[PDB]
Amino acid sequence: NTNLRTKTLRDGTTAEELFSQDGLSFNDFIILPGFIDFDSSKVNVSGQFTKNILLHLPLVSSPMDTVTESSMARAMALMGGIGVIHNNCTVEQQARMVRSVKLYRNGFIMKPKSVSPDVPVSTIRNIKSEKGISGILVTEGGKYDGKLLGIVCTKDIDFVKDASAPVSQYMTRRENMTVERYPIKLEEAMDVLNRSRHGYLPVLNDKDEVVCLCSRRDAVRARDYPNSSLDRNGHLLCAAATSTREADKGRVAALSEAGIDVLVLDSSQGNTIYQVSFIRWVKKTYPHLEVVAGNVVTQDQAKNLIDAGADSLRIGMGSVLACGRPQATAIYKVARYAASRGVPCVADGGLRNVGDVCKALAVGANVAMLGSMIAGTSETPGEYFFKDGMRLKAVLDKGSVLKLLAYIHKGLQQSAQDIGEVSFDAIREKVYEGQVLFNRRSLTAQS
Amino acid sequence: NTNLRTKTLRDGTTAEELFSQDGLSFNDFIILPGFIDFDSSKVNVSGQFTKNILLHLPLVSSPMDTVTESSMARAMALMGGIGVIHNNCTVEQQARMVRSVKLYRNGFIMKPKSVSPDVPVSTIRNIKSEKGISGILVTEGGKYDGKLLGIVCTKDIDFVKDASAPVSQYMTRRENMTVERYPIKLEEAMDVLNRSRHGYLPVLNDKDEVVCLCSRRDAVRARDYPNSSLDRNGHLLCAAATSTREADKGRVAALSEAGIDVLVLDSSQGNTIYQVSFIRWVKKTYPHLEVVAGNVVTQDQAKNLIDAGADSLRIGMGSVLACGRPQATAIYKVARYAASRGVPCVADGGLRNVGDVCKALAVGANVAMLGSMIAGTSETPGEYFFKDGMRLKGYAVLDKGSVLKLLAYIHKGLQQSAQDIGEVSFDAIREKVYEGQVLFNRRSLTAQS
Amino acid sequence: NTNLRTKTLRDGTTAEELFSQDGLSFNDFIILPGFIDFDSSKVNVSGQFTKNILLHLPLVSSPMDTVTESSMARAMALMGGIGVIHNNCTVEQQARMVRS
Ligand SMILES: Nc1ncnc2c1ncn2[C@@H]1O[C@H](COP(=O)(O)OP(=O)(O)OP(=O)(O)O)[C@@H](O)[C@H]1O
Ligand SMILES: Nc1ncnc2c1ncn2[C@@H]1O[C@H](COP(=O)(O)OP(=O)(O)OP(=O)(O)O)[C@@H](O)[C@H]1O
Ligand SMILES: Nc1nc2c(ncn2[C@@H]2O[C@H](COP(=O)(O)OP(=O)(O)O)[C@@H](O)[C@H]2O)c(=O)[nH]1
Ligand SMILES: Nc1nc2c(ncn2[C@@H]2O[C@H](COP(=O)(O)OP(=O)(O)O)[C@@H](O)[C@H]2O)c(=O)[nH]1
């Protein structure tokens, strides 16, 4: 239906004209509708977080100590986005959070949590309550590669009152265990696990030592979250923030060991000599890492940071107070310039509802960073408390971040539908082409 | 430490003097502190819901269609309180909600949900998704008492791609199942279940027909909720509301069949001839049922409804109609009169924070009814939605999260208040209030800032 | 680092264009960021109060009778600025404040 979808009258204003005068926020303009011949279910909202990482869900959790720790990053990656673990912590704590995110979901679990036979049941209960993993292997000397002696699961210890008893008293013992022998393809191993009606399947060598471990929970997670952002080994994608000082070099190394796939530079004004040097050093020393430089708001800053070797750009400054730029103009300008050079952009700031996120993605941003919009969800750091009959964490309880991410997803889909394009890549292309049009709204026209 | 706890100077105002003038609400007065020689954890907040039903947690969910359905009543019963299933529904819907509450927790599971071998996996998934029960028995002709053929659990069908496949293809077959033979004591059966590391244990006769079923989930529910309000058969307590018209008689019967333990009469002004007749008829026809009459706010009304045979009274009227009464005065007066006659009372209305609940319990109410305070928790009826960057509930209110966390918060608050007052139980607080050893101070309008 | 500091794309609006239309207050505009290769400690904020007087601190206390007398002028001069003693007084009082 290209004859019906193609605008020839072009009654409206193109992005280039809209952003050619004064700096705009998202309320200053609206997107005009197009032609619909599809359901909102079929809309692809995906966007590039970096040159090589495509997110099924163009949403990134902001690296604030009040928003993104291991739990938030896990939720984001599971729903098809990603989270940036904040850097307001020691290097070891940040690496531990990254490791939690990366080893939450696996195919073969290579370093399965293991204990020695004399460990008390209390310790396994602590592991399950704190780290949330069951099917703890009991091996010679507790080494994750030692001889397999048994396994401890939920129903093996849920009835015992003496929490100091050794696991050897209640574990399922090796002689009675369904196991597999190295080597084995993940497909066959997991189908065997399914047929076995058990929750775990260790994989051992010829010496009965633990090679790895398969978990039914990973299969069920794959079934319940088919769009999770994953690496090539089946782990959830994870990003981590860092400043560009010389000390932070150490930090970077640690994160690289923990397995981050994206490094995000933390700066209000990223067009500095220190950030340029840092990006060069990161791309040289850890080529496998992708770097999101920023923050920037003008095309000059973007030119410098892209020349340095940035894989993506963080847009935002102001969304004492004498330096910055209205956020919608910043996004349009920087994202257009960066796209001309093949670099996607992240919108960071002033994104307070679904209409704003949609506008920010339409005017050039590939993905959007969420801070306030997801603050107070169950997955954020912090403790809940009651006050005035409201439950707060301060901000009000917004429940699960997963339900909110699904809400934002449906909102973006319906908006793209009304605009008349079945994907946001198409929306951005047609915006640059002048086939998706806008209207600036007078101040009165805003209600 | 009776020398230190016993007030002889008695610097303060007794409840009788406090409520002797104009009608008061809860902000008009404060409770004076006493003597502390115990930690707040050791405080017993329990109160009588009726002549025969004691609640470890003196909280009742209000029978409003926006507050109490099966899920809320279950949560309340589990935390040591109770819920009243609302009556803004058909008799069949109310009985179904009551059944949901009553059969959630069991010892021996009677009439275990079972299916025939040709049933598709889709049906088992539907059972798990709607009603929330696993371990479906597969029997001769699907009869809950037929010959046992197998069992279908979570891990038996979580991997299957053809939801139309028969359960017999993936069920665990009877020859491989750990089972027990009638008769068996629940204690031995549950220890067997524990040792077996399985989730379910059927109990069969000599013909391999299903007699009953034990669920490990019940053991874990008992472990995680040790204070659950239970009847004598191990089921959660459940209450249900009804009006006092002639038609509602039918309703009562149905609810009685569903297994309610308390009937609650719904009326803004319960001192009527219709309610008196209804209470007489209920106590006559269903002696096993306990009735909470109301609503009332004066000792006249309380006399009539207790003479009718009420086992408890709901206090509250007004918390444009010109008739009602300030809630704290109403509670004190009616609860004092009813206690003189051996009947506990429920405070219903104007309860908006924990201090008000503590005050209402101290001045005579045995338990407190919560409506607004718990509306918008996850367990209430209604659908969640996002609006203006806020999570709300609709058929609007703000999301308060889990009602369980809220109930625990109220529990800790009541305990700390009782500690500051200097008594280790709320029965003690009520007794000492009537005795003049727990004292109050009326607050001037200025003193409330 | 002149290659990195020098704007060639010039994505933004020059002062001449900004002030070419209607009269603006300070909230009507914002300054765009540039390139950083130094610490804020090294920034020179000095400005000429007059053709021959350079102030290390480009701040002047207003000559209002509620703001600037001898003490304020002293504080300003000491911190690198200057103060203007108000003229809502006799000549002798103003001269005495100046002398102080
Ligand atoms: N490979 C195995 N061989 C034999 N028995 C096993 C094996 N793995 C687990 N078990 C036993 O079966 C039961 C495991 O159930 P499961 O793995 O589903 O527990 P979980 O992962 O902790 O979560 P949940 O049981 O609540 O679904 C336990 O009794 C355990 O001892
Ligand atoms: N009495 C029994 N005898 C033999 N097998 C049983 C018995 N009860 C349950 N099973 C089987 O145990 C295996 C694992 O149980 P499954 O995890 O699927 O459900 P569950 O025991 O209720 O625990 P959960 O649903 O939390 O995982 C299933 O194949 C189930 O059919
Ligand atoms: N037994 C078991 N181990 C898991 C599972 N999932 C992940 N693991 C592993 O458990 C380990 C937990 O981290 P660990 O190094 O033991 O603790 P830390 O030193 O405090 O970080 C990780 O190495 C994970 O790979 C599971 O489902 N079962
Ligand atoms: N298989 C199984 N049945 C249960 C369990 N818990 C309760 N039940 C029984 O399952 C039945 C629920 O289905 P049912 O009431 O017969 O259907 P309804 O008439 O439409 O409400 C009840 O008889 C419960 O007693 C459980 O854990 N497993």
UniProtKB/Swiss-Prot annotation, chain A:
IMP binds at D348, G349, G350, G371, S372. One of its GO terms (cellular component) is glycosome. This is Inosine-5'-monophosphate dehydrogenase. InterPro entries: Aldolase_TIM (IPR013785), CBS_dom (IPR000644), IMP_DH (IPR005990), IMP_DH/GMP_Rdtase_CS (IPR015875), IMP_DH_GMPRt (IPR001093). It comes from Trypanosoma brucei brucei. The lineage of its organism: Eukaryota, Discoba, Euglenozoa, Kinetoplastea, Metakinetoplastina. Its cofactor is K(+). Pfam families: CBS, IMPDH. It catalyses: IMP + NAD(+) + H2O = XMP + NADH + H(+).
